[PDB]
Symmetry: D2
Subunit: 115 residues, 4 copies
């Protein structure tokens, strides 16, 4: 599992569950090609997005649908979605965890890159 | 000034100076049209991007070029840039401050929205 | 103004207004002595806590009373308060801005330190 | 394991390893009583701090020695340590994860409280 996503909710202090996540890979014409998607689980996590064969070096974008998550909770959010854009590179450690901590008007995102 | 950008460096405890910022607006055909651009100053702030009249309702994308910034400090950062995407002015004109706190493998972004 | 405090609310996208702040300074006997206190204004800022002369070298603790703040908004927050603990002025006088971004179960704190 | 600590490093994008963590419980005279301590592991985590029998309701303080972590990396940090102060309460979910994301001049901390 070379690419994992973890989403937490900073208002409730819980995993953010059932959050839609879309991954895109940057194509040679600079457009964004759908690559992988899913919904976070009960633990706020999304696994099994891709395999080490398909996850080649390149620029990827992870798009976390935060606006629908907040609307389902009845809370009026600022952002359309959170967007994490990064280059996957074979030299460094192999596992990428993209984490996001969500508030209605703020979010943070971190990359944990390990072996 | 209805749209301003404020960038901090979380490694140096200082404003993030000369950070490039590109703003886009989603057009009717659903593409991102170039809306305004600039660089943060000595105070890590970017003002005068647009005017109330020009800053109409729509979905905006503020792209803060963090990777260029880090590289010139000799750091090799994780992200290409920070993207901040939001509906603006969809209940009448507001003032928006987009703030970003940068680390090489992390950033946070918040909005302060006030009513004229 | 050598020590100022800036507080944002990450749920409302607004300054955090009327947040109580207590600053302490570690004394020679190793206890926390009361140093200064105040409340954030309409802009979420707190100024005039101390003077350059009074703000000598030492270890300071800025306690931001976040739990009181959240409760008055009807929220039941996780933390009692944010604590920010740092050596100040140990290479000559500096200006410090302590910033905090509050959510009910999370906060972030950053320092902007500048040289007179 | 009612109380777990997770520490990440925002400059390297890795777990923060070998970080000392001291937990205190607030005594009736308002002083801080040492309660539990340890060092984060290779995965940036600290487990086995306490048991559900000893972790009674009360105010606790978790003190993460960030200054020594940054000094070991040769990086000049702002804070003496990060301090997470909170009330443990029996009504809510049972597992407390205190997470901290560290930069030299900034940190964030989040509580994930679950079942
Ligand atoms: C009211 O509008 C803002 C918003 C955020 C601000 C400031 C002003 C100032 C002060 C100034 O205007 O110079 C600082 C220092 N801000 C931050 O620290 C900051 C940076 C990034 C994040 Cl994610 C959260 C907060
Ligand atoms: C429940 O377990 C957690 C909790 C938080 C986590 C992670 C795992 C991972 C995954 C990992 O460690 O690989 C990351 C990246 N987390 C963060 O990003 C994070 C974000 C904000 C703060 Cl304030 C503190 C930590």
């Amino acid at each position: 599992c070379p690419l994992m996503v973890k989403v937490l909710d900073a208002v409730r202090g819980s995993p953010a569950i059932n959050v839609a996540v879309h991954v895109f890979r940057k194509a040679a014409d600079d457009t964004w090609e759908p690559f992988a998607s899913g919904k976070t689980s009960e633990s706020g996590e999304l696994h099994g997005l891709t395999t080490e064969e398909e996850f080649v070096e390149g620029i990827y974008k992870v798009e976390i649908d935060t606006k629908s998550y907040w609307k389902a909770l009845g809370i009026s959010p600022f952002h359309e979605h959170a967007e994490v854009v990064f280059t996957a590179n074979d030299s460094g450690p192999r596992r990428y965890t993209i984490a996001a901590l969500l508030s209605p008007y703020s979010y943070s995102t971190t990359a944990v890159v390990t072996n």
